[PDB]
Amino acid sequence: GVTSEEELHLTRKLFWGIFDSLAHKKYDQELYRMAMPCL
Amino acid sequence: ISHTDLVIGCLVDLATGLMTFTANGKESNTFFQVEPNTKLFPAVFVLPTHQNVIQFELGKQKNIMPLSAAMFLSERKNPAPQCPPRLEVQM
Amino acid sequence: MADQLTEEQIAEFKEAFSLFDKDGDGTITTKALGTVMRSLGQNPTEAELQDMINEVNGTIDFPAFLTMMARKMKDTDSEEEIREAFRVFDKDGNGYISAAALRHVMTNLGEKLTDEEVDEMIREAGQVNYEAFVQMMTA
Amino acid sequence: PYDTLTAKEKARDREKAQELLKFLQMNGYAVTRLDTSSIEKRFAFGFLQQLLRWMDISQEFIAHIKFFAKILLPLINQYFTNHCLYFLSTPAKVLGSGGHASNKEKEMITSLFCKLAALVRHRVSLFGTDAPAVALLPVLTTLFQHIAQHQFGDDVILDDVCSIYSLGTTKNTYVEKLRPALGECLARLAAAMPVAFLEPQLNEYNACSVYTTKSPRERAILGLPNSVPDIPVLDRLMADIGARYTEMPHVIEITLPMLCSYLPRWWERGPEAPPPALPAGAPPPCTAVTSDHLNSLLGNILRIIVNNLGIDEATWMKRLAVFAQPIVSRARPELLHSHFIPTIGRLRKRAGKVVAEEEQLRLEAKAEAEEGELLVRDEFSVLCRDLYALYPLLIRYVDNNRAHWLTEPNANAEELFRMVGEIFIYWSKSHNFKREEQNFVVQNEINNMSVATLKKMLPIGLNMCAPTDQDLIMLAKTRYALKDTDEEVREFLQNNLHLQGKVEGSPSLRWQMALYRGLPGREEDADDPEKIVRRVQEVSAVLYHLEQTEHPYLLSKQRRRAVV
Amino acid sequence: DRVRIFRAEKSYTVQSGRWYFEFEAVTTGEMRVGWARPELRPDVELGADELAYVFNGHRGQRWHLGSEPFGRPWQSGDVVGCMIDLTENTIIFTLNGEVLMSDSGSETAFREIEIGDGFLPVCSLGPGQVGHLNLGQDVSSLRFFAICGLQEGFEPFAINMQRPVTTWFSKSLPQFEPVPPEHPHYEVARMDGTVDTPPCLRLAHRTWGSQNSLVEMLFLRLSLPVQFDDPEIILNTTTYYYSVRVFAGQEPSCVWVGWV
């Protein structure tokens, strides 16, 4: 996720690697795969 | 974890039907006796846990002949052990 | 080769090189070539100017400069010439071309190519865009 | 970060961490500060934070930044995951997903007939529409909210006797209504908005000049799957007190619309002025066969299509019903409980018309076949107009297919004769598409914007039924006739040659393996009156059909460069 | 113990022509119906590989190298037949005299099949259910046929025989048989005849990933009916000795030695 609202550049990597965001359909019903932690 | 080979040998007396079992040359407590007219095939059951598991030897002891000179009528008088091609394992 | 550049841009390069001539002998060093090359518009990184001396001592002359400029423009010219030369082949210029139309126009490009060659060329492949033609001929 | 550690450091360091708390619990030192929390719902919760915002940060200034980029990244990502899974609605059911559909619906409002920037959100809503269409429903009243703008939208027709609310707000409306099908909640004040839309649209086809769109006119049929004011006395106005077997629903036009259609069918009705309302509402008259089992009024369902066929039997003109033919989709559902065992005249209505169409096509094909006087002016006369009859032919064939997908059992059994007329007249493409008629083969637009696509594909369904009444014993001569037709011997010029072929020979293998059943299933007649004809029927017919399935179914590294 | 499959004897193996049979079911359990190659290996569910082309109408699945969704589930009766045409190498199924469409709609999607060693009708049965084959030895009993068959060129598998088709089945009862020397993970060999060590047979294995193994209840091949050194004692003795040696890395806890 990270910076979802920063570089407003239309030709940025955001509009380029937008398909990389969809690359997460591998996980099935792993909505309850783990708890909730960060840094 | 044993680094040595447990060798089990068995003893079958045909004119009495008495069966005994030797463990590394030390006789075990068990024994078996059967009916007169019955047959038997030598058997090993195993769940394997190694690359090399078992090895059916066909040898004789100090004063008794091998299984080879017991199944063939022609060979019933030659004490030398033999391994004819008919002897095959089954699964 | 050095024949893919018209005379006017050769003149422009000569003027740019002469404007910062060292002592009239055309001998210039590594730091100043980047300055003179960034003076006339093209401003790339430092890697290409690092490899330029590798292809050809601290003694740079006009012929070497012209050759390296020529063959760094020629790749772009060749990569771009495959799109403009197709503009005449389609009426609208977008890329769509009827297969029946080329039967009487693609045999008269001046290459003396008769019907058999184009038979084999188009048979080995509706309307076909320009990129499929790129894959078709460049191979 | 720790979440991305390897399996070695996520099993031993946790052990180095889990046991420390266990040591804490020793001597009573407790320090505290698989529930389906669902990361998907957490993603929705992460979307909720964006959903709770959205109009809170944008519409607060839009209706009165770099933040206007997340909407052009998250909305595109939502079109995949929702369409990727499409099976979450089976196990761990959560109403939290249905919330985002409505939470965004309020954000999708503002200008539900205009808006700005992107309209793909409407398509993104269509994707989430499939996800939906105990608790089930709660704080929403979206249907009640749907009755808001849709109410004055009925006056929009009177405001030209709202411009994209009949497009965008009617997209997901007609979708979810037609996407329901499976589940069915209830009907609380839905009929109120429906009757405020139905009766309003039932007379909205009278306003000329601006007839608007007929797309939403099919949305009434799309929503025709709820339950049971034109005549709603004890159902609309006089029903604000508080739903059993009230014997009254579409009975306001039960026999009325039936008599109206019968009178509409009785009249010519060969104009756009005809039907009109029916051309944009009588397509919903077939949806009434849903809750009514198959068809209690079986004769009604066996005549409503026949009367509709009469409207098609009326035959259009040039353009005419160019767009007025997309209602054939609903026609492929009226043939469900099609107990049209009667047919006969209706069968002839499908036959004689086609025969008239075959005669009309022959009047056009022979006008092109017998016109080679070197003139390209006939291309506008002979051709072009062929596409008019072609598109007309691609309308009745899409109805007779499903009709033959039920009239084949008893038809092929017992006897025949009935469908034998259809088979003998099914040589349409045989006298066109197979008759080297390039013009008829030049569907072009008919082939594109309306290979294997009807025409002769329909003949394959009855090809077996055609050969069923053929040789009940000795074929043989059919193979000789196939070789004769292969030599191109016209038509009747081969039958005379086929008339001189000794006799049928069969007295060896097979026969009792095959004609034995035919000698017990036929029981009709046997004479020399048959001769060819019946043998010359499928002979030249399957001949061209076989041809359609026969054959019909350099440069060095240098010169290359130069050409470029 | 799990399934009891049935087939025809492999000298009706067919290599050219157009053939048919129908199947009859009473219950709605798990039935496998289709064609099969003559080398049908038992103890393997059919349709999991290239050996047999089969259709399962319980969940609308066709099995060849794995499952695939095809067709609708059953009802009672379940009159199903099997089409076959080696000319175009295509297999079609019909339910109640109606061909089943594919996912997008086609002719059973079973195409491009090699002749090989011909094919056989095959049928299985899950527990508790009952099946009734009909190889077509009399045509009146063949129920639907007519609508499919006659007017496209077909006749049934047993159409002209004076005696009914014999059939086979899997027994279940285990029986001893010599080890085939192509068993993935099992290798046996004869060792030697040296002076010191007597002749002996040994084993091997592929101890790694891929697959594993259970308990190999092995047994040699021969017998020893009962009976009804000094050269004196060894020519009169009736007692003989054999020997096994468990090597290292094998636990004697999981080793049983004796007679059977």
UniProtKB/Swiss-Prot annotation, chain A:
Q: Where in the cell is it found?
A: Sarcoplasmic reticulum membrane
Domain of life according to the entry: Eukaryota
Quote the tissue specificity entry.
Detected in skeletal muscle (at protein level). Fast- or slow-twitch skeletal muscle.
Q: Please outline how this chain is modified post-translation.
A: The N-terminus is blocked.
The task this protein performs is described as: Cytosolic calcium-activated calcium channel that mediates the release of Ca(2+) from the sarcoplasmic reticulum into the cytosol and thereby plays a key role in triggering muscle contraction following depolarization of T-tubules. Repeated very high-level exercise increases the open probability of the channel and leads to Ca(2+) leaking into the cytoplasm. Can also mediate the release of Ca(2+) from intracellular stores in neurons, and may thereby promote prolonged Ca(2+) signaling in the brain. Required for normal embryonic development of muscle fibers and skeletal muscle.
Q: What is known of its domains?
A: The calcium release channel activity resides in the C-terminal region while the remaining part of the protein constitutes the 'foot' structure spanning the junctional gap between the sarcoplasmic reticulum (SR) and the T-tubule. Pore opening is mediated via the cytoplasmic calcium-binding domains that mediate a small rotation of the channel-forming transmembrane regions that then leads to channel opening.
Family, similarity comment: Belongs to the ryanodine receptor (TC 1.A.3.1) family. RYR1 subfamily.
Q: What does the further note read?
A: Binding of [3H]ryanodine indicates that the heterozygous channel is activated by Ca(2+) concentrations 4-fold lower than normal. Single-cell analysis of cotransfected cells shows a significantly increased resting cytoplasmic Ca(2+) level and a significantly reduced luminal Ca(2+) level.
Record-given protein name: Ryanodine receptor 1
Q: Which organism is it from?
A: Oryctolagus cuniculus
Q: Which residues of the full protein are shown?
A: 2665 to 2703 of 5037
Curated annotation (Swiss-Prot), chain C:
Pfam families in UniProt: EF-hand_7 (PF13499)
**According to the UniProt entry, which residues carry Phosphothreonine?**
45, 107
Known CDD domains for this protein? EFh
- Additional comment: This protein has four functional calcium-binding sites.
Ligand binding (Ca(2+) 3): 90, 92, 94, 96, 101
Please list the residues that carry the modification Phosphotyrosine: 96, 130
According to the UniProt entry, which disease involves this protein? Ventricular tachycardia, catecholaminergic polymorphic, 4: An arrhythmogenic disorder characterized by stress-induced, bidirectional ventricular tachycardia that may degenerate into cardiac arrest and cause sudden death. Patients present with recurrent syncope, seizures, or sudden death after physical activity or emotional stress. CPVT4 inheritance is autosomal dominant.
Every copy of the EF-hand domain together lies at: 8-43, 44-75, 77-112, 113-139
Please provide the record's keywords in A-Z order.
Acetylation, Calcium, Cell projection, Cilium, Cytoplasm, Cytoskeleton, Disease variant, Flagellum, Host-virus interaction, Isopeptide bond, Long QT syndrome, Metal-binding, Methylation, Phosphoprotein, Repeat, Ubl conjugation
Q: Where is the signal peptide?
A: none
This protein's record includes keyword Methyltransferase = no
- Positions modified as N6-methyllysine? 112
Q: Which residues bind Ca(2+) 4?
A: 127, 132
Per the UniProt record, the source organism is Homo sapiens (Human)
Which Gene Ontology terms of cellular component type are present?
calcium channel complex; calyx of Held; catalytic complex; centrosome; cytoplasm; cytosol; extracellular region; myelin sheath
**Record's InterPro entries?**
CALM/Myosin/TropC-like, EF-hand-dom_pair, EF_Hand_1_Ca_BS, EF_hand_dom
Instruction: Specify the protein name.
Output: Calmodulin-1
What SMART domains does this protein map onto? Answer: EFh
Summarizing the annotation, the consequence of altering residue 133 to L is:
In LQT14; reduction in calcium affinity; not changed protein abundance; not changed structure; significantly decreased thermal stability in presence of calcium; no effect on RYR2 interaction; significantly reduced ryanodine-sensitive calcium-release channel activity; impaired negative regulation of high voltage-gated calcium channel activity; impaired regulation of cardiac muscle cell action potential and
Activity regulation as described? (Microbial infection) Inactivated by S.flexneri OspC1 and OspC3 proteins, which specifically bind the apo-form of calmodulin, thereby preventing calcium-binding and activity.
List of residues that carry Phosphoserine: 78, 98
Q: Where does Ca(2+) 1 bind?
A: 21, 23, 25, 27, 32
Query: What gene is this protein a product of?
Result: CALM1
Q: Which SUPFAM superfamilies match?
A: EF-hand
Curated annotation (Swiss-Prot), chain D:
Tissues and organs where the protein is expressed, per its UniProt entry: Detected in skeletal muscle (at protein level). Fast- or slow-twitch skeletal muscle.
What is its subcellular localisation? Sarcoplasmic reticulum membrane
Q: Reproduce the UniProt comment on modification after translation.
A: The N-terminus is blocked.
Q: What else is known?
A: Binding of [3H]ryanodine indicates that the heterozygous channel is activated by Ca(2+) concentrations 4-fold lower than normal. Single-cell analysis of cotransfected cells shows a significantly increased resting cytoplasmic Ca(2+) level and a significantly reduced luminal Ca(2+) level.
Family note: Belongs to the ryanodine receptor (TC 1.A.3.1) family. RYR1 subfamily.
Q: What does this protein do?
A: Cytosolic calcium-activated calcium channel that mediates the release of Ca(2+) from the sarcoplasmic reticulum into the cytosol and thereby plays a key role in triggering muscle contraction following depolarization of T-tubules. Repeated very high-level exercise increases the open probability of the channel and leads to Ca(2+) leaking into the cytoplasm. Can also mediate the release of Ca(2+) from intracellular stores in neurons, and may thereby promote prolonged Ca(2+) signaling in the brain. Required for normal embryonic development of muscle fibers and skeletal muscle.
Q: How does it assemble?
A: Homotetramer. Can also form heterotetramers with RYR2. Identified in a complex composed of RYR1, PDE4D, PKA, FKBP1A and protein phosphatase 1 (PP1). Repeated very high-level exercise decreases interaction with PDE4D and protein phosphatase 1 (PP1). Interacts with CALM; CALM with bound calcium inhibits the RYR1 channel activity. Interacts with S100A1. Interacts with FKBP1A; this stabilizes the closed conformation of the channel. Interacts with CACNA1S; interaction with CACNA1S is important for activation of the RYR1 channel. Interacts with CACNB1.
Q: What is this protein called?
A: Ryanodine receptor 1
